[PDB]
């Protein structure tokens, strides 16, 4: 996030980090319950990648995080790799997350929910702060 | 060129499709929602993370970080997967698995 600001540690407890087997962070995602994460289809997640929950400081080796293996990847079959439309993938975890002060789920909307233009919303992540 | 160690956040407005198409034109498709152009930008490594709004006091997932300006310009609209267009597919997938 360019020109964002540091979050309060643990205040976004559905935010996960998707990492390869070596610990490299390549995408974020959101816990929607103890067994499922929603993320983007273009992240290209596979069952060799891991969901890291409860993280704040990726440079801290001592933080209490949950490294969770992925059982199966459900890419939306309508994801359009030319137009980027329908950019959603579900990850079914092979071991459930343990909910806690720093790990819990975001709510999902209903399909007819309307969020007005101009509503102040929030986005989070460990993406670049400068390109 | 490296990512921050510590989780970042930014507040930002949802944009109407109409105001978003004033920059991105026909690249905006029916399962996309725009937000930002407000001095902040999602950038490399944010993809797949959340765009949340309050709905009845509780944070609700409205977008998934997807694409935008190729240099993460803070004055262009960021584009997110529109969760209301995709949540029926989410619920169907959970129910079947």
């Amino acid at each position: 996030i360019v020109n964002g600001e540091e979050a309060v540690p643990g205040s976004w407890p559905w935010q996960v980090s998707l990492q390869d087997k070596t610990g490299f962070h390549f995408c974020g995602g959101s816990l929607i319950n103890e067994n499922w994460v929603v993320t983007a289809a273009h992240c290209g997640v596979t069952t060799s990648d891991v969901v890291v929950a409860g993280e704040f400081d990726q440079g801290s080796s001592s933080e209490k995080i949950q490294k969770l293996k992925i059982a199966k990847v459900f890419k939306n079959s309508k994801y359009n790799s030319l137009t980027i439309n329908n950019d959603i993938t579900l990850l079914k975890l092979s071991t459930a997350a343990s909910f806690s002060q720093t790990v819990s789920a975001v709510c999902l909307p209903s399909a007819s929910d309307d969020f007005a233009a101009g509503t102040t919303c929030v986005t989070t992540g460990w993406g670049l702060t400068r390109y | 060129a490296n990512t921050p160690d510590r989780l970042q956040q930014a507040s930002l407005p949802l944009l109407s499709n109409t105001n978003c198409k004033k920059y991105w034109g026909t690249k905006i498709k029916d399962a996309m929602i725009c937000a930002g152009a407000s001095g902040v930008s999602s950038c490399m490594g944010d993809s797949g993370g959340p765009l949340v709004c309050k709905k009845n006091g509780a944070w609700t997932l409205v977008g998934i970080v997807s694409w935008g300006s190729s240099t993460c310009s803070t004055s262009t609209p960021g584009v997110y997967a529109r969760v209301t267009a995709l949540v029926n597919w989410v619920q169907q997938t959970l129910a079947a698995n």
Binding site: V8, G10, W12, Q101, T102, A105, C107 | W59, T60
Partner: peptide
């Protein structure tokens, strides 16, 4: 869902 145990602070 949607209610963090640690409340976010936005600026």
């Amino acid at each position: 869902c949607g209610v963090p145990a640690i409340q976010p602070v936005l600026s």
